[PDB]
Amino acid sequence: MKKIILTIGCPGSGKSTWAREFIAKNPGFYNINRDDYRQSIMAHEERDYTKKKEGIVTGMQFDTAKSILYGGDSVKGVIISDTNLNPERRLAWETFAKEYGWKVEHKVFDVPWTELVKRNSKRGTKAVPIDVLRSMYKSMREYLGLPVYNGTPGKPKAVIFDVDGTLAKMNGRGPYDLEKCDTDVINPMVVELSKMYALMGYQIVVVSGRESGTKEDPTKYYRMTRKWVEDIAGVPLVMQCQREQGDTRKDDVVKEEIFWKHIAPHFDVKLAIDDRTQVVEMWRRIGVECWQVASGDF
Amino acid sequence: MKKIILTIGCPGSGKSTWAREFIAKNPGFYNINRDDYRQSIMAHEERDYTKKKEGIVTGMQFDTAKSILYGGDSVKGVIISDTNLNPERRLAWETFAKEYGWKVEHKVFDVPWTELVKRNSKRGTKAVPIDVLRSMYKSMREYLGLPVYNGTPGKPKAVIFDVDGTLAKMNGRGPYDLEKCDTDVINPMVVELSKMYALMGYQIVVVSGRESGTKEDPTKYYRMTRKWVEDIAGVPLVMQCQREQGDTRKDDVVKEEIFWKHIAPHFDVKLAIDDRTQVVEMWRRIGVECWQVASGDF
Amino acid sequence: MKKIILTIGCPGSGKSTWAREFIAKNPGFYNINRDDYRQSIMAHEERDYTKKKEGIVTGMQFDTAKSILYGGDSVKGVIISDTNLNPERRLAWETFAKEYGWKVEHKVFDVPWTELVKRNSKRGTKAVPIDVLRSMYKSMREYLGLPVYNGTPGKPKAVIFDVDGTLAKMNGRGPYDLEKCDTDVINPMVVELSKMYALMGYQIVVVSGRESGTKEDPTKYYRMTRKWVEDIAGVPLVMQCQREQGDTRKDDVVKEEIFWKHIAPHFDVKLAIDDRTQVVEMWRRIGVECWQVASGDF
Amino acid sequence: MKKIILTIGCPGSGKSTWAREFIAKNPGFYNINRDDYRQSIMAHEERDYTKKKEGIVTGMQFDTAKSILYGGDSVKGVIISDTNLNPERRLAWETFAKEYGWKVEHKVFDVPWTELVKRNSKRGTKAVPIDVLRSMYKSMREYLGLPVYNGTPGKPKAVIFDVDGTLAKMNGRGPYDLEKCDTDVINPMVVELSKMYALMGYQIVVVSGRESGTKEDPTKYYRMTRKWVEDIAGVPLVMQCQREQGDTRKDDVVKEEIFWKHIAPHFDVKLAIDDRTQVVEMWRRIGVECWQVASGDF
Ligand SMILES: Nc1ncnc2c1ncn2[C@@H]1O[C@H](COP(=O)(O)OP(=O)(O)O)[C@@H](O)[C@H]1O
Ligand SMILES: Nc1ncnc2c1ncn2[C@@H]1O[C@H](COP(=O)(O)OP(=O)(O)O)[C@@H](O)[C@H]1O
Ligand SMILES: Nc1ncnc2c1ncn2[C@@H]1O[C@H](COP(=O)(O)OP(=O)(O)O)[C@@H](O)[C@H]1O
Ligand SMILES: Nc1ncnc2c1ncn2[C@@H]1O[C@H](COP(=O)(O)OP(=O)(O)O)[C@@H](O)[C@H]1O
């Protein structure tokens, strides 16, 4: 059968680039894009929203697929290089292909949020607002079937606190120089908050993206951080999780893995306090309310 | 009735700009472009030619017109912002509109050749080869019903010779400084050519884009040029035509007007010898064989 | 004297555009840009940081100013179209101009933060990271001599809470439809927070960008909001400030004016809880620690 | 010593690309470009000519070279990525480097005229007018020390005539289908011209870019062409030169090689008649007056 290839991915994920390259290497494939169409019927009005226009672009897409997909044995298929993140539209393509006898394949472009943001900020006039991008990424996560937290019944309620930038600031050292992280001063209001919650009966769970330690001393930083939280901040934590030694992945990935493995099953986490934008974005995205206490664009 | 507006014009004539502006001012109008389509189905392969692809783009255009033109009383019409310089395709749009009951209007963008070339050279990746541009302009002229020469029966055969850059060069003066045009030296081979033709029985007609003269002396330059051709070159001309005093139009326009009014009806012109690119382009375009004797890109 | 015009403004404020336009209208003025230089010596390496390179660009700038500023009576001056937000560099230009006898003028481009961000997100490859942009804006504010809060001694400590998106969410209405703002449901954790602080002895000050009311009923929304906070949330507030009726300025401006006039002189504000990104950015920028409780990119 | 690398090449020859790549691979090298400077002092006025501005850019270049070239052992050299096609300016760089003790190297980018034109037509806003490009190429040829014809004393005078498009047109075949080149019809006026010159005593030399023949019959086309010229056109030629079988180079190169080897030493060639633009450009460039008899943009 002729293929109908739907690209699935948030804007800037590489869908168009792939489409061009693929067509350049496999004769018999054509591209259909709601976007070449959207810009076209408007004579290229800057992207800076009608149900009718969208109805036109939709008609263009299917009518164009039918015509192309009926060429001779020369035509192999069509690529629908849109985000295709709306489930109903994806279904519409499959039921369309079933009645005309064509097969539907998916070409996924799962790019990390941090890469999506980075690329999007350079997209120029094709850049998309952060809120629609975050919305696209949420749909992408639902497509991949990634987990969303909804509480842990029968478990004590808890608040998650990060260390760097949240409970602590930094008294003249420098990001990634943990050897002197014992000099960090307290962020008064946040430190105070953690004590307030404890009094309210919440379990205080501390998390940190600081590497636990070095190759020869795997918990060097985990220990200093623990002493700092105990002796300097005075935070009555029930648990302290931290990036494992050697682990070079993004705080992003590291903290979520830590969450599902070590926190979610033991606590009914009601809140997370953090400062790094990519982490704060991770928390809210997986279902955990998150309060950002300072600028964290790094 | 709903309108189907066909833009008629060579590339770079302003068709897209107008289309955007018009849609921005008149809600209910949509744009259809073989080109948004051509680039789209190929995932934007650089423009640097199949009868099948063109068949697809064509289908897209009509199918898209039908759908749009059938919206409610909200839709006023569609703009077909292509060159639409191929007569058969223009007819195809009119017979298409007649059977579905829509009206066809034309929005012409007649830009002068010299402006087309100028703009095209800056078009970047959308620039078109000079030969296809010259071809587009020829079709545009046929659309406008502009005249093409095919000889003048019963009249003596003649060769047209230009002066500046052709019969004469320039001995240290400067373009537009006719006050010293009497110092020009002969272009030997070309001067010799004119005498050769005379011997062959051709009438030698001299033409010049040099203003005839000044406001107080309207033939100052016409006279010097005539003396130069007689005494210095020794060209046995039967007629000498020249740009009228005060006339500020392009050599382009000036020489063709001169041709139809004063030459075409009295001579069977078989050839024209010239050096300025825009003039040489004019000659060939209206049906007169033209030999360019030197670089004339000014 | 010849002028040395320093443009003062964060990237994207219009410095280059103005410079081009000004030179186009006033012959005798030349442009010097650390940036044409930075890109140039590197053969245009993508902007994606050496003290030596910067030393070169600096030398280029002054050496180029000296040469230009010494032309004849034809030269009027030079424009230094950089951000010029670093005070020491600004001083360096003035002491440079004093010893050579030239005058220094400033051309300020004070664009609102929200406009800077908006423009920056479309800047493409010239876009600047949000953290350096926020840093530029902080220096711009210091240039303008705008106020920075540092506490109010002798006054009771307080926490500022916003309503929309912070204490309340929204149960099926829509932004700007205050007529049904009485249906908003509580944001449990945040509502709880306000009570926690009260117990700790902090004064709870509520702020809202919701227009107080309509032309015929100037406190319609102020009253509903007040009842909602009292009866539904149960927030023990000491004061409630809100956007005045008719006022169409940005929440940005509105809340800061409200802060200086009605809050700062009566309270020692230690914290602000809010959700809208532009407001959260305003709080931190003027010296008030701010916790963002949810995505607020609208 | 520190190096001063001058790039030598017409615009579009790859000078900037090379410069970026080289700097990216060899730390210690900086780029100086009259052009980053020209655009910069004018706040980027579209390129669409003062002796003073040029004086400023010049000062910027040398002053910037001195400063850079005096860094520590870290600096290796500077690249002057301009065309550097003006001999006096090249000399100025060498005498500048001699007095300060630096060495001057050249990095040449000799791109074929046809490639220069091709690239230039796509250059967009950086495209250069054809006449300045042709001027740049002439200087490049003088730099390379390429030959320029100035006549052959003691030898009979001759006119060179091309076949395809000049003496012959084409009666329904197609470029590169020589198997049916025997069907070409005469271009009357041009054929007549060749006879006129013969009567005047000129030697008629015929040249053709048509491959002489095939691998199994190396003169198949040379013979048909010769018969066509003899029996159909009636051209009294003294010599017939033609592209050798197997030779795949551009007509460009092929005809000039043919000229120097077989024509220049036996004839005092006074004129060449041709129709292909790249060939016509070759003729004039090497010193031979050339008349283009029809559009030859292919
Ligand atoms: N692997 C990559 N690394 C760096 N940049 C990339 C990569 N892939 C794509 N980009 C850039 O991101 C932007 C997204 O382009 P595009 O292919 O059209 O994505 P999409 O069609 O999914 O919106 C482009 O400017 C592109 O050059
Ligand atoms: N009146 C004008 N003066 C100068 N430039 C123009 C003018 N009109 C159009 N152009 C330029 O010429 C190019 C042709 O653009 P476009 O509008 O798309 O023409 P077309 O659709 O006919 O090919 C554009 O880069 C445009 O900016
Ligand atoms: N008043 C304005 N309205 C909308 N966009 C603007 C305005 N002024 C400038 N811009 C855009 O913002 C970007 C900033 O350009 P630029 O003039 O170089 O600023 P700067 O030199 O201060 O960094 C440009 O892309 C420009 O077109
Ligand atoms: N080898 C090549 N093949 C195709 N295009 C090229 C090549 N080299 C350069 N170009 C293109 O030609 C233009 C000339 O660019 P540039 O490097 O700045 O040349 P120059 O500095 O000599 O004027 C560019 O748009 C470039 O991408």
In this complex, do A60 and B64 lie within 8 Å of one another by their Cβ atoms?
yes
Same domain, B127 and B240: no
Q: Per the structure, how many domains does chain C have?
A: 2
The active-site residue, picked from A2, A3, A15, A210, is: A15
Torsion angle of C-alpha atoms D17, D19, D24, D25, degrees rounded to 10: 110
Name the closest-CA residue to atom 18, ligand 3.
Answer: C16
The 3-state secondary structure of chain B, one letter per residue: CCEEEEEECCCCCCHHHHHHHHHHHCCCEEEECHHHHHHHHCCCCCCCCCHHHHHHHHHHHHHHHHHHCCCCCCCCEEEECCCCCCHHHHHHHHHHHHHCCCEEEEEECCCCHHHHHHHHHHCHHHCCCHHHHHHHHHHHHHHHCCCCCCCCCCCCEEEEEECECCCECCCCCCCCCHHHHHHCCECHHHHHHHHHHHHCCCEEEEEECCCCCCCCCCCHHHHHHHHHHHHHHCCCCCEEEECCCCCCCCHHHHHHHHHHHHHCCCCEEEEEEECCHHHHHHHHHCCCCEEECCCCCC
For residue D96, tell me if it sits in a domain.
yes
Provide the CATH number for the domain around residue A279.
Answer: 3.40.50.1000
Partner residue opposite B189 with nearest CB, options D121, D271, D292: D271
Q: Which of D6, D61, D66 is nearest to D35 (CA)?
A: D61
Q: Write down the H helix ranges in chain A.
A: 15-25, 34-41, 51-68, 87-99, 113-122, 130-144, 188-199, 220-227, 251-258, 277-285
D124/B122 touch (CB, cutoff 8 Å), yes or no: yes
* Residue range(s) defining the domain that contains residue B225: 156-298
| CA-CA-CA-CA torsion sign (D169, D175, D180, D181) | positive
User: What is the rounded CA–CA span in Å between residue C243 and residue C251?
Assistant: 8
The Å distance, Cα B17 to ligand 3 centre, comes to: 22
Resolution of the experimental model in angstroms, please? 2.3
- Deposited experimental method: X-ray
Residues 6 or more apart whose Cβ sits within 8 Å of residue D295: B131, B134, B284, D275
B8 falls within a domain? yes
Q: Coil, strand or helix: which one is C3?
A: strand
D79 lines ligand 4 (CB under 6 A): no
User: The tokens of A113 are what?
Assistant: 């949020």
| DSSP class per residue in A111-146 | --HHHHHHHHHH-GGG---HHHHHHHHHHHHHHHT-
CATH number of the structural domain spanning residue B61: 3.40.50.300
Residues B166 and B139 in one domain: no
Q: Do residues D288 and D188 share a domain?
A: yes
Q: Is B151 inside a domain boundary?
A: no
Distance CA D145, CA D140 (A): 9
Contacts of D129 (CB under 8 A, 6+ apart): B121, B297
- Same domain assignment for residues D132 and D184: no
**Residue C140 φ/ψ, nearest 5 degrees:** -60, -45
D190/D237 same-domain check = yes
Give the pair of three-digit tokens for residue D224: 């048909």
C35 within some domain = yes
How many angstroms does the Cα of residue B262 sit away from the middle of ligand 4? 49
Q: Does residue C151 form part of some domain?
A: no
Give the list of residues 6+ apart from residue D92 with CB closer than 8 angstroms, or none: none
Examine the domain organization and report whether A135 and A177 are in the same domain.
no
**D31 within ligand 4 shell (Cβ under 6 A):** no
- Which among A193, A171, A147 has a CA at the least distance from the CA of A286? A147
In a domain, A11, yes or no: yes
Task: Indicate the angle between helix axes D251-258 and D277-285, nearest 10 degrees.
Answer: 40
Please state, in angstroms and rounded to a whole number, the distance separating the CA atoms of residues B295 and D290. Answer: 9
Same domain, A174 and A199: yes
Tokens of A181: 């992280």
Which residues, other chains included, contact A192 with Cβ-Cβ below 8 Å and sequence gap of 6+? none
| Structure-block tokens of residue C244 | 């005045």
Region of C14 (left: φ > 0; alpha: ψ -120 to 50; beta: rest) is: left
**Ranges assigned E (strand) in D145-238:** 157-162, 203-208
Phi, psi of C274 (to 5 degrees): -155, 175
**Is C15 an annotated catalytic residue?**
yes
Q: Is residue D118 part of a domain?
A: yes
Is B128's C-beta closer than 6 angstroms to any atom of ligand 2?
no
- Decide: D167 and D161 in contact? Cβ < 8 Å: yes
Q: Letter for the amino acid at C245? A: Q
Q: Is the separation of the CB atoms in A294 and A275 below 8 Å?
A: yes
Based on the fold, state whether residues D163 and D290 are members of the same structural domain: yes
Residue A270 lies in a domain: yes
Does chain D touch chain B (at least 3 C-beta pairs within 8 Å)?
yes
SS3 D171: coil
Per the CB < 8 A criterion, the answer to whether B110 and B144 are in contact is: yes
Question: If we measure between CA atoms, which residue out of C149, C229, C223 comes closest to residue C194?
Answer: C229
CA C21 to chain centre: 26
Contact status, residue D80 vs residue D19, Cβ threshold 8 Å: no
Please indicate, yes or no, whether residues D83 and D184 belong to a single structural domain of this protein.
Answer: no
Active site residues of D: 15, 35, 123, 162
Q: Which residues of A touch C (CB under 8 A)?
A: 121-125, 127, 129-131, 134, 189, 196, 200, 270-271, 284, 289, 291-295, 297-298
What contacts B15, CB < 8 A, 6 or more positions away?
B7, B9, B81, B82, B83, B109
Å from A104 to nearest chain C CA? 35
Kindly state whether residues D126 and D193 are assigned to the same domain: no
Q: Nearest C-alpha to atom 25 of ligand 4 is from which residue? A: D123
C139 Cβ contact list (under 8 Å, min separation 6): C85, C86, C87
Cβ contact D41–C24 (<8 Å): no
**How far apart are the C-alpha atoms of D297 and D278, rounded to whole Å?**
8
Name the one residue in this structure whose structure tokens are 């009518």.
A63
